[PDB]
Amino acid sequence: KSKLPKPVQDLIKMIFGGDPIDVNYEKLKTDIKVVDRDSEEAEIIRKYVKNTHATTHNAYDLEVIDIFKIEREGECQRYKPFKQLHNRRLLWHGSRTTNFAGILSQGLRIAPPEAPVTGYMFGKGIYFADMVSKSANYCHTSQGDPIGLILLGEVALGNMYELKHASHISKLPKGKHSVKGLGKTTPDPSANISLDGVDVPLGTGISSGVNDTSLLYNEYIVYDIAQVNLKYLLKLKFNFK
Numbered sequence: 001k002s003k004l005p006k007p008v009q010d011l012i013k014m015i016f017g018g019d020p021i022d023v024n025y026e027k028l029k030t031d032i033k034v035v036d037r038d039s040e041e042a043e044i045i046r047k048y049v050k051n052t053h054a055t056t057h058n059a060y061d062l063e064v065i066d067i068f069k070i071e072r073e074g075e076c077q078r079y080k081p082f083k084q085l086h087n088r089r090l091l092w093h094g095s096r097t098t099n100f101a102g103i104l105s106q107g108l109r110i111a112p113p114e115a116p117v118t119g120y121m122f123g124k125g126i127y128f129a130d131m132v133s134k135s136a137n138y139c140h141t142s143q144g145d146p147i148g149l150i151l152l153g154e155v156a157l158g159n160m161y162e163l164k165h166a167s168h169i170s171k172l173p174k175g176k177h178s179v180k181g182l183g184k185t186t187p188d189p190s191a192n193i194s195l196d197g198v199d200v201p202l203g204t205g206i207s208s209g210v211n212d213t214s215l216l217y218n219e220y221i222v223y224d225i226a227q228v229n230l231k232y233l234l235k236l237k238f239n240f241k
């Protein structure tokens, strides 16, 4: 009775634990398309995964099962103020499978005003990595449950407030659009690629040459939900050490 392509049906099943597949699909308010395995997009994405897995995160390997291109209703319009902003980057965001119904239906949101701050170095915002594994850790996948989901969002970073140490940012300095936490390791900046006019930092990790930083790896934080345009959802296989 589902009229969806099988990979999308299996995505839906995964995301929703009673209701028919197609009705649960509609709840996501998200256009979802299978990216062809042997397409240019899929190649770039598999490379991003391949190259940006941190050496510190060696309890598992990642295999891309399916790549989905996703279009949240309303997001094109919402993102529009930032679509020409400079320094737009394709970055990872990992979360538990059980969050993905909410995430797709309502977009990535900032943690609510009253949630606890532990876990967040730079206050309540939306957090992204340029290292797939840093984000993939937040899938809270296990031996027993080895399949997880991760997003690639276009993030309008603009002028980044670049910090090495934890600071609960209540208000960005004038002219800044985002915070970047500076890691000791960074994808090779010379190996950046452009996909649909969005920078993809898929170079292998090199020393950043940033001294006295508390972060191993970069992270990027936006404080306005409108600065995020979700693009891809990957179904990943975690193979454990």
Ligand SMILES: NC(=O)c1cccc2c1O/C(=C\c1ccc(C(=O)N3CCn4c(nnc4C4CC4)C3)cc1)C2=O
Residues within 6 Å of the ligand: 092, 093, 094, 095, 099, 111, 118, 119, 120, 121, 127, 128, 129, 134, 135, 136, 138, 219, 220
């Ligand atoms: N998620 C990422 O890809 C990511 C990337 C880079 C840095 C950070 C990232 O997540 C960060 C923090 C973080 C991520 C997750 C959590 C986490 O486990 N939380 C508990 C429950 N929870 C939270 N958000 N949604 C939920 C579920 C109940 C509805 C907070 C706490 C903190 C970073 O500092």
Ligand SMILES: [Cl-]
Residues within 6 Å of the ligand: 137, 138
């Ligand atoms: Cl973690």
